Design an enzyme around this catalytic site. Sequence first.
Site, PDB file in Angstrom:
ATOM      1  N   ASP A  37       3.870 -19.810  28.096  1.00 29.50           N
ATOM      2  CA  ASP A  37       3.353 -19.199  26.873  1.00 29.50           C
ATOM      3  C   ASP A  37       3.902 -19.783  25.657  1.00 29.50           C
ATOM      4  O   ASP A  37       4.997 -19.590  25.307  1.00 29.50           O
ATOM      5  CB  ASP A  37       3.743 -17.679  27.106  1.00 29.50           C
ATOM      6  CG  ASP A  37       3.183 -16.809  25.845  1.00 29.50           C
ATOM      7  OD1 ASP A  37       2.444 -17.493  25.051  1.00 29.50           O
ATOM      8  OD2 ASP A  37       3.465 -15.875  25.486  1.00 29.50           O
ATOM      9  N   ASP A 222      -2.032 -21.643  21.752  1.00 30.08           N
ATOM     10  CA  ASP A 222      -1.325 -20.557  22.504  1.00 30.08           C
ATOM     11  C   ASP A 222      -1.852 -20.678  23.882  1.00 30.08           C
ATOM     12  O   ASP A 222      -2.933 -19.896  24.024  1.00 30.08           O
ATOM     13  CB  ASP A 222      -1.641 -19.335  21.637  1.00 30.08           C
ATOM     14  CG  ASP A 222      -0.900 -18.060  22.299  1.00 30.08           C
ATOM     15  OD1 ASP A 222       0.044 -18.183  23.375  1.00 30.08           O
ATOM     16  OD2 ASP A 222      -1.242 -16.906  21.916  1.00 30.08           O
TER      17      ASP A 222
HETATM   18  C1  LIG Z   1      -0.137 -10.553  22.280  1.00 29.97           C
HETATM   19  C2  LIG Z   1       0.243 -11.751  23.628  1.00 29.97           C
HETATM   20  S1  LIG Z   1      -0.027 -13.214  23.061  1.00 29.97           S
HETATM   21  C3  LIG Z   1       0.914 -14.282  23.743  1.00 29.97           C
HETATM   22  N1  LIG Z   1       0.690 -15.716  23.507  1.00 29.97           N
HETATM   23  N2  LIG Z   1       1.769 -13.996  24.612  1.00 29.97           N
HETATM   24  C4  LIG Z   1       2.102 -12.779  24.919  1.00 29.97           C
HETATM   25  C5  LIG Z   1       3.590 -12.526  25.276  1.00 29.97           C
HETATM   26  C6  LIG Z   1       1.312 -12.288  26.320  1.00 29.97           C
HETATM   27  C7  LIG Z   1       0.673 -13.080  26.839  1.00 29.97           C
HETATM   28  C8  LIG Z   1      -0.042 -12.856  28.136  1.00 29.97           C
HETATM   29  N3  LIG Z   1      -1.191 -13.507  28.365  1.00 29.97           N
HETATM   30  C9  LIG Z   1      -1.808 -13.474  29.486  1.00 29.97           C
HETATM   31  O1  LIG Z   1      -2.000 -12.535  30.266  1.00 29.97           O
HETATM   32  C10 LIG Z   1      -3.132 -14.764  29.627  1.00 29.97           C
HETATM   33  C11 LIG Z   1      -4.088 -14.531  30.392  1.00 29.97           C
HETATM   34  N4  LIG Z   1      -5.002 -15.769  30.583  1.00 29.97           N
HETATM   35  C12 LIG Z   1      -4.671 -16.852  29.799  1.00 29.97           C
HETATM   36  O2  LIG Z   1      -5.477 -17.808  29.903  1.00 29.97           O
HETATM   37  C13 LIG Z   1      -6.509 -17.829  30.846  1.00 29.97           C
HETATM   38  F1  LIG Z   1      -6.083 -18.035  31.942  1.00 29.97           F
HETATM   39  C14 LIG Z   1      -3.446 -16.947  29.064  1.00 29.97           C
HETATM   40  N5  LIG Z   1      -2.684 -15.834  29.020  1.00 29.97           N
HETATM   41  C15 LIG Z   1       0.063 -11.406  28.748  1.00 29.97           C
HETATM   42  C16 LIG Z   1       0.942 -10.519  27.957  1.00 29.97           C
HETATM   43  C17 LIG Z   1       1.674 -10.877  26.903  1.00 29.97           C
HETATM   44  F2  LIG Z   1       2.726 -10.227  26.364  1.00 29.97           F
HETATM   45  C18 LIG Z   1       1.766 -11.628  23.770  1.00 29.97           C
HETATM   46  F3  LIG Z   1       2.624 -11.981  22.794  1.00 29.97           F
END
Ligand SMILES: C[C@H]1SC(N)=N[C@](C)(c2cc(NC(=O)c3cnc(OCF)cn3)ccc2F)[C@H]1F
Length: 379
Positions: A37, A222
Amino acid sequence: RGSFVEMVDNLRGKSGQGYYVEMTVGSPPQTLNILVDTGSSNFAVGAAPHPFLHRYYQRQLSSTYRDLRKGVYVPYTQGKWEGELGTDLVSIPHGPNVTVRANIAAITESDKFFINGSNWEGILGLAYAEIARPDDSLEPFFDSLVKQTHVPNLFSLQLCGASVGGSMIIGGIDHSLYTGSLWYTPIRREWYYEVIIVRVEINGQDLKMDCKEYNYDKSIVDSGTTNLRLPKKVFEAAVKSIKAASSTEKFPDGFWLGEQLVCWQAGTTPWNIFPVISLYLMGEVTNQSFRITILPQQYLRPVEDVATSQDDCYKFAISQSSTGTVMGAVIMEGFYVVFDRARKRIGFAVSACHVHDEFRTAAVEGPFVTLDMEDCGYN
Ligand SMILES: C[C@H]1SC(N)=N[C@](C)(c2cc(NC(=O)c3cnc(OCF)cn3)ccc2F)[C@H]1F
């Protein structure tokens, strides 16, 4: 310095659930799958038996665990986690051959954080200390890695779009993961991976917006976001333009707003009816830009989990944002992305694994002459 066969294909995942790397924590090593991430800065791992978790960090089993006697409550716009801060020994089995003492947030309560059915148990926040919770004194993992070892201050990500995969090359670049040249954009400020979008085109047709709109109030790279997220106005103009370019077939308003899926019969997707989307990014040199171009196969992503449909269903994965532009998996799946932290820059090159057809490919092209690129940055 340019071939890391050990780390190729060290990323796994499921479509829409993100990209994870295997990691070990504690002594003896406890194996955990960790979401990669670039839009956060905490190394946060499940540490209690939440029923969705395959496994979790068990501090009681680690002889090298140290307590910082400090909690942290992390809310998001939808969902939260709360954790206990400590340090421990961390390594990456399919990464560099090192062991690092790193901050770990041991997750003790969460809500809408872990994905039911996902195969990861924590998040590796790869962005900088400024956005670390609770404050910038909590050193991010990659900072600890670079400080404690001889690993170069660089990582690169090849995200390949039910099973997804790719590579996280830690400390370098693997040249087999891209074609053509890398083109670099400056990291505007070291908090998120902030970049400046300079011009937007839909099928070569410029949006003609004041480029300050594109970066209102920031633009970020991101890996932890699925969508290409655009500021509200930019989204409106973009969609109007995508509608016009694809007016051969009509679609309901709710599809464009991500409120409905749209389905076709198997193999009968009209990819050629949907436009390419080009983002011009600030280059390394005054008045110089470059252009990254994505396909419909990046922004129109399959929804496999539809029980009520026997057809091929899709989500429009460009959506409106109030936190600025987010170049999520929709962008990153098209490209090999080099987070050149040492030189405060991000490299884009066409991904060797990106999804395309016989007619169109994702593209990284330059140089272009763009004036007043500094005005595009929001203050
Ligand atoms: C608001 C979010 S945004 C971010 N960059 N990071 C935080 C830590 C965060 C991210 C996520 N990601 C996903 O579940 C996910 C799913 N599919 C993706 O791509 C296609 F497979 C990419 N990421 C889940 C929980 C989280 F807590 C939050 F800050």
